[PDB]
Amino acid sequence: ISVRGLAGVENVTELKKNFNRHLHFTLVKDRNVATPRDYYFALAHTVRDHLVGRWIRTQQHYYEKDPKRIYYLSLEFYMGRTLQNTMVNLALENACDEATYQLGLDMEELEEIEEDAGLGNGGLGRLAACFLDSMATLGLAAYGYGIRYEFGIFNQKICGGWQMEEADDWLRYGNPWEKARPEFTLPVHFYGRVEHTSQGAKWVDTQVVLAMPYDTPVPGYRNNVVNTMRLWSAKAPNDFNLKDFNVGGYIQAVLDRNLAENISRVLYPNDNFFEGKELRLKQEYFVVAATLQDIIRRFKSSKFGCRDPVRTNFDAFPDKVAIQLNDTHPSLAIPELMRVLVDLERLDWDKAWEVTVKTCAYTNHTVIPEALERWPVHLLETLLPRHLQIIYEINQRFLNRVAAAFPGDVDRLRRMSLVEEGAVKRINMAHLCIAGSHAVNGVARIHSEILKKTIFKDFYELEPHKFQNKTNGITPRRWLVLCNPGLAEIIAERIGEEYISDLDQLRKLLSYVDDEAFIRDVAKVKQENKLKFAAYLEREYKVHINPNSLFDVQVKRIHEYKRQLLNCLHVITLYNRIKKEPNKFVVPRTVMIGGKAAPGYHMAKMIIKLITAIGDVVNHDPVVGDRLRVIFLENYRVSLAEKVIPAADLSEQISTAGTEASGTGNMKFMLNGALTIGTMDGANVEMAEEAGEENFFIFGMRVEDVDRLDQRGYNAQEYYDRIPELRQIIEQLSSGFFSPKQPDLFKDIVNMLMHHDRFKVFADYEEYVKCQERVSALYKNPREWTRMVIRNIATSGKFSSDRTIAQYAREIWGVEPSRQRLPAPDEKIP
Amino acid sequence: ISVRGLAGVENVTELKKNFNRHLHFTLVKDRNVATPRDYYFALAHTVRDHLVGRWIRTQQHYYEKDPKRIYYLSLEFYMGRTLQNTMVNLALENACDEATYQLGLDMEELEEIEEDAGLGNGGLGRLAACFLDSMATLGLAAYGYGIRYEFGIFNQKICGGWQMEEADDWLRYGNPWEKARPEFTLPVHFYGRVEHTSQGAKWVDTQVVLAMPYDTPVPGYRNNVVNTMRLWSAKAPNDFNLKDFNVGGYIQAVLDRNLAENISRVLYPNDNFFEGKELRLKQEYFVVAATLQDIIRRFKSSKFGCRDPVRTNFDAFPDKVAIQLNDTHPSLAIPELMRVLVDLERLDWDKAWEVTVKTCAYTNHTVIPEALERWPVHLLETLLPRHLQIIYEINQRFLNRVAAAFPGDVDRLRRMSLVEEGAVKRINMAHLCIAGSHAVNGVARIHSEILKKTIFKDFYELEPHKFQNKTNGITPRRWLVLCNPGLAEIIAERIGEEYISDLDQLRKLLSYVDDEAFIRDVAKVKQENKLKFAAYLEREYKVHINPNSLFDVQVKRIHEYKRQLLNCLHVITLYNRIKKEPNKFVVPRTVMIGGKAAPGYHMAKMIIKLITAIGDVVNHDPVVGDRLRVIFLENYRVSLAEKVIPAADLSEQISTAGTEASGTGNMKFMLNGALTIGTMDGANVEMAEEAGEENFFIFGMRVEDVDRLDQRGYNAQEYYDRIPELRQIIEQLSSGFFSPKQPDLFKDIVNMLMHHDRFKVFADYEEYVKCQERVSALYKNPREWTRMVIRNIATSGKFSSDRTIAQYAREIWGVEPSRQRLPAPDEKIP
């Protein structure tokens, strides 16, 4: 059937009875009233059973051996569905397929019932998810720590061409994967005030919110390692949230508990954008405060909570603990670690600071200013008074270091300060992270260089040793084997299966680049993938597409910097050229654009409307026929990504040079047989460098060009004046060609494009359509297109998150990855 | 070990492995980190397993045979713990005891970990719970329908002698007994307006709240019948509760979902008191609206949703459905049934009315005016506009009936109206229930007569056939076998086990009233019970009591009508007599008073403080010694009741004649070997009539006396003037004898007692202490005390809820109870 494992005789039988056990005893249903949803659950529980044994021994294992622990703190974990991934990592896929088949059910139909765990916004959240999979696969004692939002990223609905947001109640039917651990609930404090008494400061009169943990298993790939992802949920204490007496109402006091519990209610739907709301800051401290107590408790046990030097010496803390900050969201971990160490454990400042810097490491994910976290001082002052005091003290000592290093450089002092003066004082969380971490890294080579050369230049000059790079990656398990079994199979037929956990081995595919059979196969799976997607489209969304055309897709969050608008200009151009010469042949294309716009992002929502507006005209023009279709992919998410990416021919990574930190969707397309048209931005540079620029469709300005243009001054009118095709498009938008009933509907887009385009869309227009012509030319030559595809796939190995993780482990955490199978799952009950 | 069933070889082995299965796979724990709470859960899941098989076949059974269904609607179900009760009804108690013993665990210690399901206030809620147990034991196709509050009756804490309330988060660690059924979610409407168009009225522009059901199994006693209790939970829709667009905030819209979900958040803690809050009315309509759609859906299937006459003829509705209204809380079921039948199904009014009256039956639980539900018209008008219109129409036609029957009687017309004029117009829900039900019943003989003679006199004259009586009862399973196995054993040694489901057989115990062995045994178990309770007291609450003294206990909600104050007067009297003649012998007593006060009930909270105030003085007076102890039993609830009742010697049922509808605690004490000192009120009359007045300690005014006194006019001063002992007590309270630091602390109590005592405490004082002297005299004669006890126990059979239910079944619902074992639980998987 494929190498989804063995369909053993004993195990298919065992699976079936356990499926029936759960359908009866767990779901309390009988075959005569069971619905597909019940069947999905019976299966999920049956599969979950297989990893609890391993989960228990893995955790027990870490307790006995006591290795250095890695704590990955993030406010986002974009997991997606977990049934198939678990089967894949446990080699249960074929057995389960066989078993459900014999039970007369279609496993694929049941897999579609699982809701996505959309606890993330996009790239930052999905990276964390890929990282977790890689850390388990590499046998690291790693824990993912975050917030269990009851409402994840909103479900997107397109009404009248407009995006409609609706709550993502992913827990509505329950989550069979998580395990509530009420017994490990911890208290978190807010507000209060600081008392300075005799031997130390005291954080007093605080409001308490409880943090209840929920653990989700994270299985490594076929190594019997099952790590843990711990998500915190907010709960109101039953005392003060009722006991602070003297009138108000008993009923009201109980109803008001949903005020402390609102902290973990919903994920902020912002991508690459900072919103300074109090609820956000509470979420940030909540995850940090709870996570740190858990980390220290585990440390106090270790082998110190037995003997060792005997005396809670936190000198060994950094030798046993490593905490990675996924962006600045969990940045309060630095002043919170100091608070505990200094205020509670009573360590002297300097010893505490040495420990803190040695265990903390910070990763930066963006350079756009509006994405930078700068919290107003009055907020921190009210919500976290002691922390503000600690931050000021950290700043005081840091600036003293600067002054000593750069005597007289008074401007450098204000530039490097963690405290920004002006309208309202703010705290620059990024500066905080750099100061309190022993390592700072970018997520792609060019992005990391940009941090050193621009944004954190002064910091780099002070401590050059801190700055590093760790190019992002993606897990080959979910992003190949899971979503593209057909491609994984033909690759395995030639080079084996060892590449799933050693992607570098894909290079061996280079020697089949002239193989006639392979070329035919690679081309066949892509065709099968496009037919399946073309079907799914009419199935769930309804209104036909042509599977023979070129599948041109750009899927990612909607942003001005991602330039979906530039893609739009090209689409309208294609349309205008066809209308000019109807009977001329052009390569048919189906351009698919999908992505969510943050609810408050007006321009991004305007762009979604433009896209659907273009589709309304283009898709109903009889002269165009099936040569050009414009489709907006609704509710783009992880599960949807697993469907489109394997079916794409052309991957659009067209951000303005210097704005996309790395990108990861680009890597997903490369591994799945799509060719890339893009700018020299983020990881695109390393991808073209790995495949060879001849096998990549690069165009537009490089970072240097963008700067040259900024010195000069960007004037969009120039481009409008010298390019008739561009002018024609702008006048079409301006006059209502795409919005008849509302002729001025797109005035904001045109106005912006002509007067305030921060991402110089027009500057890359000419080179973009010229480059698009080259891809069309190559598509007309199936054999050569596929051969270039093989060059990309065979050369994507470097982009596996196993490589990224191995580098974090060795260069930042100080731990050695291992591909050693943990001693089977075998029963055991001590 | 006792007759808690057989400890079979095969089953103890089977139990142990399943216990281990759950500890591992369900709790994901290993013996080395499992805590007593984990063990309790492993056991609960193992026990729960045994009844899912029976649950499925019982429900399937009702589907095939299609009998008339009984729907018990109540806003309260006071269930308590469910582990032991389930073991008892499944004959699993000894096997489980043995198995956990071999696993090295103490089953009793684990049972204490289970949280009480306190979804009720007291008697009304516990009756529903007893009823459910009896309906299953009698093989009736009955369903309990209510609300799944996430916070039940508050946990009571005594601080400085004052009651402190704290949220009852009973779901904090999860509920292993319930089964969420998200697939059966239903929509409920609120607000909106009424449109009158061509062919009928339309309820329009309503706000929708979803009702999600949770099913809890209700096992019958050893008959393999497992009925269902369906509790509704409020959920916000994900559309409009986000989709009603045009600014407000996406985050805020999501956070505001906890506004529609607040409907099922907390139980109103009022006992015998009406609070007209909008949240309460929403709860009432919520349970009714959801329950009715479920009932009709089930009906539409039956054997009509196949063939029969073919044409949804609701003429057979009352032949297949019976809905019992537990008080007026679910009274909107009447106008809601009409709404659906008339507005949706399009039945003519009269056919709809005939159907409604024939399926609805109403039970009244109180006669005090402040407990009567009278909803302001402006509330119904805003929240349920169509229902108000239906109520007015029902009223119009009803009053026409009255006028025709009593021509010219204009005052009778306004007295009987469902609409009360005055300050604000209100709707008298009780009048509504009587008009739309084919049966109205009281809960004890005297209470039922009072309804006919007083409160509903006019209604009784109009339709005498509607009024009936159904004296309350208690389940012998939980209230004997479960809480008092020792007594159940010795009874079974002589007369067998058939009495557990046929309590009348207890009469056979009369012939052992002179048996020397039995007298010694009955006295021995009571002594063992008192020693266990005396221990529990120091264990969990700490500060010693004497197990040789007479256990004088009054446990029930705190109310002026229950007269805990009268009990207090007696206690202070005993104390004053001892201080007068220290060296005189008196029978030692431990008087225990426990009960919760509604949070807003100031006087009731003042009484709790008085009780603890008396204990402060009495318990620390060296002259008193161990002859008198005053103890306030904290957080009185079902699980606590199961501990005190079996250990009591004297049961206090001293309400003012005519105020306690029935009472059920009185019945619990009688069955467990306590003697009763009380008034001729509620079921006390039938109890003394069953045991013989010679074996009962009756005192005080009868109903007639109370009325005579009211004609005359009640003047407390008279009693104060003629009784020195009473005067002395009042002057002790007034002067601060019981409240040194705050001498005027009890001015409200004294003021009330002297000028506004609605329950004439002083009028029964003399006869009360005189009667108390008689019980003390009899206690001095162990042999005769125990013989009188045997007379009570042997004669309590009539008070089993199996008797009550059998009467409701035959005289109201029209169904025949059956003690036929359902065809085993045996596997089966069709």
Ligand SMILES: O=C1NC(=S)N[C@@]12O[C@H](CO)[C@@H](O)[C@H](O)[C@H]2O
């Ligand atoms: O997706 C992202 N959202 C933010 S904010 N930063 C992001 O992080 C990802 C993971 O490092 C990068 O791949 C994206 O380029 C970057 O925009």
Ligand SMILES: O=C1NC(=S)N[C@@]12O[C@H](CO)[C@@H](O)[C@H](O)[C@H]2O
């Ligand atoms: O306990 C009760 N609370 C209210 S209100 N009415 C009650 O109902 C019980 C069940 O019928 C009766 O036993 C009580 O006498 C009555 O007060």
Ligand SMILES: *Cc1c(COP(=O)(O)O)cnc(C)c1O
């Ligand atoms: C991989 C992924 C992303 C990141 O895509 P980019 O193109 O780097 O912005 C966002 N959303 C989902 C659903 C993804 O799978």
Ligand SMILES: *Cc1c(COP(=O)(O)O)cnc(C)c1O
């Ligand atoms: C039986 C019971 C009641 C009712 O007691 P009465 O004395 O009739 O008021 C109230 N609360 C609990 C906990 C009960 O078990």
